[PDB]
């Protein structure tokens, strides 16, 4: 889902001026945020494997 | 002790049935997201190149006459550019909506999983209860044997 | 098949020998970029899979 998220967010970016604006504002931040949260979840399940 | 036995057995039986019911519910929620993932996959047909592969066929033409439409031909150009842009927007909005629906059903799955965890903890508590009850009943039988 | 794409974009239908030295070449170059970018995105999907 996240790979598809960054794909669609970048398509919503590269269209035009306000497209860049709204999509890089919302999902440009949401990609980093959901990615860091997601990789924290990666680390948690990896620690459960490690536990 | 036997009344407590039967009451807790019926209790944990209802608990087990309810846990299986909630498992069926969350499996059905997991069946519901199939339409959402397939919809956003069949919308997912454009990625980083296909924007330019839309910018070029709107740059295409059929009829040319070298004069008298310097910008009149460009009217159709700019309007079809805005067509393809706004075609990307509304589908992007529907993409946003269905990802929010994904977050909603994932919240459903998470709350159901917490209910699963708590009811399974209560189920294991009742396992301890009914196990000790059955054990002391078996003791009572063995007590009568030693009698 | 790269060259077998470079040739049919080099093809034409209508010719008039004047007044489109490069106006005809606009469609040429744009369809060249079409076939190139058609190779790119499919190449990216190839990378992904």
Author numbering:
A (entry chain C): 259 to 309
B (entry chain M): 149 to 295
C (entry chain N): 198 to 246
Sentences from the paper on this structure:
We have unraveled structures of the soluble components and the pore assembly of the YaxAB cytolysin from Y. enterocolitica. The crystal structures show an atypical fold, comprising a head domain reminiscent of ClyA family toxins and pronounced coiled-coil and foot domains unique to the YaxAB system. In line with our finding that the isolated YaxA and YaxB head domains form spoked oligomers in solution, the YaxB head domain in isolation was sufficient for recruitment to membrane-bound YaxA. Together, our biochemical data support a role for YaxA as the initial membrane-interacting subunit of the toxin, able to bring the lytic effector YaxB to the target cell surface. Therefore, we propose that this class of toxins defines a new structural family of α-PFTs.
Along its largest dimensions, the C10 symmetric complex spans 160 Å perpendicular and 200 Å parallel to the membrane plane. The map accommodates one YaxA–YaxB dimer per radial spoke, in which the head domains form an extended interface, while the coiled-coil stalks remain distinctly apart. Notably, YaxA protomers are not in contact with each other in the pore, but interact instead with two adjacent YaxB subunits in cis and trans (see below). Embedded in the amphipol membrane surrogate, the foot domain helices of YaxA and YaxB protomers form a staggered, 40-meric α-helical annulus with a diameter of 31 Å at its narrowest distance. The largest contact area between pore protomers exists between the head domains of YaxA and YaxB within a spoke (cis), burying an average surface of 1476 Å2 via a close network of polar and hydrophobic residues. Across two spokes (trans), YaxA and YaxB interact through a hydrophobic patch at the juncture between head and stalk domains, burying a surface of 1088 Å2. The putative transmembrane segment of the C10 symmetric YaxAB complex consists of 40 staggered helices, jointly contributed from YaxA and YaxB foot domains. Notably, YaxA foot domain helices α4 and α5 cover only about half of this distance, requiring YaxB helices α4′ and α4″ to traverse the entire theoretical bilayer. Inside the membrane, two adjacent YaxB protomers form a hydrophobic seal via a conserved α4′ (V197, F200, I204) and α4″ (L227, L234) interface.
